[PDB]
Amino acid sequence: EEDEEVLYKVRAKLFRFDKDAKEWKERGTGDCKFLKNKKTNKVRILMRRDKTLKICANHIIAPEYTLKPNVGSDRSWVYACTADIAEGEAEAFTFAIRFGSKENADKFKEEFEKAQEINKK
């Protein structure tokens, strides 16, 4: 993360959908950062768990992604990610990310979409 600019940082709880069960499972709580690589100009989400500092999200903010609401929340987004490497080899997930307030959630979407435009350049 030495070669990266922090465009945005927000406290968040990340979930992944377990389709075999039929439930959301927490993956981590901590600072979710949008990081722009200064050499390549590509923007990624990188999120680490509090205390252990383990990566729970590491993926490019792909222009193809779309943030959708969850039925139970006015302060969360759900989206399909096709290449997250937090746990090792690239893997597809359906993520949900929840924030401390609706205001933070709405700011995340705005920043997410700005980052998508950067990645289109």
State the residues that interact with other proteins by CB under 8 A.
1, 11-15, 17, 19, 22-29, 37, 42, 44, 46, 48-56, 58-60, 62, 64, 68-74, 76, 78, 80, 82-85, 90, 94, 96, 98-100
Contact 62, 82 (CB under 8 A): yes
The pairing of strands 76-84 and 55-60 is: unpaired
Contact 3, 37 (CB under 8 A): yes
| Smallest separation (angstroms) from other proteins to the CB of 34 | 13
| Smallest separation (angstroms) from other proteins to the CB of 118 | 13
Counting Cα atoms < 13 Å in the Cβ hemisphere of 50 gives 8
| Smallest separation (angstroms) from other proteins to the CB of 54 | 6
